[PDB]
Design a binder for this molecule. Structure first.
Ligand SMILES: Nc1ncnc2c1ncn2[C@@H]1O[C@H](COP(=O)(O)OP(=O)(O)OP(=O)(O)O)[C@@H](O)[C@H]1O
Ligand SMILES: Nc1ncnc2c1ncn2[C@@H]1O[C@H](COP(=O)(O)OP(=O)(O)OP(=O)(O)O)[C@@H](O)[C@H]1O
Ligand SMILES: [Cl-]
Ligand SMILES: [Cl-]
Ligand SMILES: [Mg+2]
Ligand SMILES: [Mg+2]
Ligand SMILES: [Mg+2]
Ligand SMILES: [Mg+2]
Ligand SMILES: [Mg+2]
Ligand code: NA
Ligand code: NA
Lengths: 386, 387
């Protein structure tokens, strides 16, 4: 592995397609190795742009737009941060010689639920919830009847729990459909009754597949609120979780860190979905590991061996997710949100108009329970105004 | 403490005066809090500028130039990375209401050996090498005569060893005096301390008081640190004494921030040497060794936030990547052999080199400090620096 010096002729150039808080840390990790960073998003002054050598604003779902920026910047790597991007162009570009992280196919399969679910369940024969896809209200109703109650309906292209409804009875059929349309095609999944859920951060690298200690999390409105590590699990469940994760990542292909979402039922594990990149719940790794999930993703995609990952003990993250409308957000009472074994991150997002993740609180303790309280408490201390 | 959002009207603005690798990490820590960063240096594309919102290239020794940039950017904090700045202008600006980290007086006292040394030895009554100031070869010649051999001669406005000479013999004096003019017309003649080892006691002064990082040991060569490690093994008595010295010094200098207190240890005795009113290069080991790096600590402190505690993650070490060549397009090969479990490397982004220059650093942890040092050294040594 050979790296150039940023801004010099032999520079190693990385293009980030999505400049949110996750891309921001990847940018900082690239910058720490003198890697040249070009940050792309759909709005100006996006978090990763604050720490990039150059920034561009385009429609990331527009293949033509994608090709233009790639031709202009000639990056060695293209690192997407989200699912909603021009995956067919990524495939083309990859064929033309661009290194798409982890690979264009991994991005194509995961941008919509159909690609990934069918691969996991049908091709890899991994355990998953029951599911049925639907492209009409009528077919939607037929799917629910077959799957049974309760079930969850979700748009095939969505994130953060958007357009999803937990369906308990036929009464909600009409509204569930509407709501889902607001997020065409949908997935209807049977409800898995897990003991708990985890994110297994799995790194595929030149030296093999590595696993971070399991990360547990709390969802609210199908969006992450708190995360912690390590999540206690049986030896058998851990092993089965690792086998599943290893299969998924290798099937998807290429080097990078993946966030494998799993449901745990005693010693049994069920596959949910996977981010072919750093995962939001993995932000806990900003305090809990020697190498954060961001540092690990960078290490792997550059072709360097991971070697190993150190976990420092019980830790947790808690989101800073206010609700307001402002283009000039401020954060007060910060003196009461940081301290011994307690930190915060403020993303630099330029504005908000409703609910948006503006930061994260991080803590360590002698138990995950204590870490979770410490982190939640700190996040709540922050006085968001605008 | 109220923080705005960078690039927004209520943004909190930090101006870095010096954009090297140390400034680069402070910038990162500011950016992690959505603090707006303006990186200033005397050359373009300095490391901290890569990660800043914007930058300016000026002669930091030119007070007017300094005022102009300051006035243009209206920063809420002015954070120096080096001694070579128009400190007089810092004083004024502070007088006009600017927040200089840790305080302007602190910078002034330490940019001139005569200030800090007199403060420490005289005012503070602390243990230091013997020394003498002089304004003429006569006085110099005279002084070296008072100190004896061997002895060190340093400009009063010198760093990285620039303009220094270790004198064991009279023949040198030709040179000595002339060298003290090469770099930096006044000097200091210090006695030689025969310590068991040197340490850097990273001391943070914040709203919740003064806290210490575990002592950092190091190896210097040709005025450049080569390897540093933590924690350096010393007696509790010695550590206790070191902290005392550090506290006394930081509080006397005043202001919030992270200070690098340089000390010598002989048995249970500790001798004050000097202090950086900012993060110290040897403290780069803290990038792997603690929950809060010296850079994170500096920012936490200057922003008026509480530190609470500092966690140390066992034996750790840093080893510099310090090649010597001339190039404006450096590349680094064999990196795959410089990273792995408990091992990381940093490459600074310096635009060019023309002689000896620090281009990166290797960081390692292990079961023993010795093992940590070797792991780090070996890693730094595997990087192939091409021109
Ligand atoms: N079949 C299922 N059974 C039980 N709970 C489920 C099921 N599907 C999803 N959930 C719950 O809803 C949460 C969100 O689901 P999911 O991750 O599929 O949505 P998303 O929109 O893709 O969110 P993101 O991509 O941000 O993780 C899960 O983390 C889990 O708590
Ligand atoms: N009196 C002394 N006795 C023994 N060694 C000394 C003495 N003064 C300096 N040294 C050695 O030289 C190194 C550099 O000395 P000093 O720190 O005073 O120089 P400097 O130019 O101010 O460098 P910097 O500001 O970058 O540390 C010390 O770290 C120490 O190893
Ligand atoms: Cl996404
Ligand atoms: Cl189906
Ligand atoms: Mg998802
Ligand atoms: Mg999410
Ligand atoms: Mg999910
Ligand atoms: Mg000095
Ligand atoms: Mg020194
Ligand atoms: Na920039
Ligand atoms: Na790839």
């Amino acid at each position: 592995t050979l790296l150039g010096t940023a801004l010099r002729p032999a520079a190693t150039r990385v293009m980030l397609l999505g400049s949110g808080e996750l891309g921001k840390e990847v940018a900082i990790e690239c910058q720490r190795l003198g890697v040249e960073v070009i940050a792309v998003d759909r709005y100006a002054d996006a978090p990763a742009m604050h720490v990039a050598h150059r920034s561009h604003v385009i429609n990331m779902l527009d293949g033509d737009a994608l090709r233009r920026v790639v031709e202009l910047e000639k990056p060695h790597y293209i690192v997407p941060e989200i699912e909603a991007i021009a995956t067919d162009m990524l495939i083309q570009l990859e064929e033309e010689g661009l290194n798409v992280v982890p690979c264009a196919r991994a991005t194509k399969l995961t941008m919509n639920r159909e690609g990934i679910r069918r691969l996991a369940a049908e091709e890899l024969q991994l355990p998953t919830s029951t599911y049925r896809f639907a492209d009409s209200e009528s077919l939607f109703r037929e799917a629910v009847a077959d799957i049974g109650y309760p079930c969850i309906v979700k748009p095939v292209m969505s994130s953060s729990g958007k357009g999803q409804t937990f369906i308990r009875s036929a009464e909600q059929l009409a509204q569930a459909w509407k709501y889902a349309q607001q997020g065409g095609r949908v997935i209807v999944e049977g409800v898995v009754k897990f003991d708990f859920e985890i994110t297994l951060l799995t790194v595929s690298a030149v030296d093999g597949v590595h696993f971070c200690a399991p990360v547990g999390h709390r969802q609210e409105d199908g969006d992450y609120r708190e995360s912690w590590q390590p999540q206690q699990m049986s030896p058998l469940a851990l092993e089965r979780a690792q086998e599943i994760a290893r299969k998924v990542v290798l099937a998807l292909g290429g080097y990078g860190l993946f966030g494998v979402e799993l449901f745990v039922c005693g010693d049994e594990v069920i596959f949910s979905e996977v981010s072919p990149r750093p995962h939001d719940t993995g932000m806990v790794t900003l305090i809990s590991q020697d190498l954060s999930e961001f540092a690990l993703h960078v290490r792997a995609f550059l072709g360097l061996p991971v070697g190993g990952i150190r976990q420092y003990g019980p830790a947790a993250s808690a989101v800073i997710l206010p609700q307001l409308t402002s283009q000039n957000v401020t954060f007060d009472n910060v003196q009461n949100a940081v301290g011994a074994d307690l930190q915060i991150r403020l993303f630099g997002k330029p504005e908000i108009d409703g609910s948006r993740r503006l930061g994260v609180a991080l803590a360590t303790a002698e138990s995950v329970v204590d870490a979770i309280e410490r982190a939640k408490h700190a996040a709540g201390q922050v006085k968001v105004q605008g």
